[PDB]
A paper describes a structure:
Sequence and phylogenetic analyses showed that EaEst2 belongs to the Family XIII group of carboxylesterases. EaEst2 has a broad range of substrate specificities for short-chain p-nitrophenyl (pNP) esters, 1-naphthyl acetate (1-NA), and 1-naphthyl butyrate (1-NB). Its optimal pH is 7.0, losing its enzymatic activity at temperatures above 50 °C. EaEst2 showed degradation activity toward bis(2-hydroxyethyl) terephthalate (BHET), a polyethylene terephthalate degradation intermediate.
The crystal structure of EaEst2 has been determined at a 1.74 Å resolution in the ligand-free form. The structure was refined to an Rwork of 19.6% and an Rfree of 21.3%. The asymmetric unit of the crystal (space group P212121) contained one EaEst2 molecule and 169 water molecules. Additionally, our sequence analysis revealed that EaEst2 possesses a conserved pentapeptide, GLSLG, in its amino acid sequence from 91–95, including a catalytic Ser residue, which is a typical consensus motif in carboxylesterase Family XIII enzymes. Collectively, the EaEst2 enzyme can degrade BHET into MHET by cleavage of the ester bond and cannot utilize MHET as a substrate. As a result, we investigated the possible interaction mode between EaEst2 and BHET using computational docking simulations.
Residue numbers in the entry: 3 to 246
The structure:
Amino acid sequence: ITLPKPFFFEGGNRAVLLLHGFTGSSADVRMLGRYLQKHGYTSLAPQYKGHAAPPEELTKTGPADWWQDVLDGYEELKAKGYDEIAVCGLSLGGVMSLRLSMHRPVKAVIPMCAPAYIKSEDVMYAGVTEYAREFKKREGKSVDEIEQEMAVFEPMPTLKDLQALLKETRDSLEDVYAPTLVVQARNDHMINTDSANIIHDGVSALQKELIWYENSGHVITLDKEKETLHQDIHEFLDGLNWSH
């Protein structure tokens, strides 16, 4: 199985930190990164600990690890000399983008299909087992091989910390001052889509907008309205107060 690695795509002086989703990878934001590169923007996509790896590694990690990966990616951009950084993320990546805007200076925040409601731990964990099965099926494992491995698959007690991160972020949205573009797929079966209104309504940012994508599902970057999303993000980024 060929695992996605992190990326850094050079464009101009203007930088965007691209954050993937829970069980996702840099693959979730690679086409957006390429689009941005072609239009003047530099991007860097980190990957979270336990992701782009066998699923048994994922259950040994938690949001304390993933949050440090976000900060490490932000810091890598500033270490390369990019002092103006917008932050854009998919699902959990959108939550990490909002949290990052509360902790570090960012030019803008673009949460895409970010969850702002709290699902039961067993529903979250069921998403991790679906993920593990689909990984093992991409490994060409037999249905017996997959069932044997899933029968010893360990719990993930850090999902309760992931619930806490969602709740803290929802409860602290007034702390977001940076210009905010909320992106939300209409046909999202993975989160409560009202989260888009919670986030849009909750941030203190004067400069904010909510765009609904009427023919897309949760993984909006990979779906049929990705082209429109790219242009919408591009126009938003171009209207920001960049030094040059």
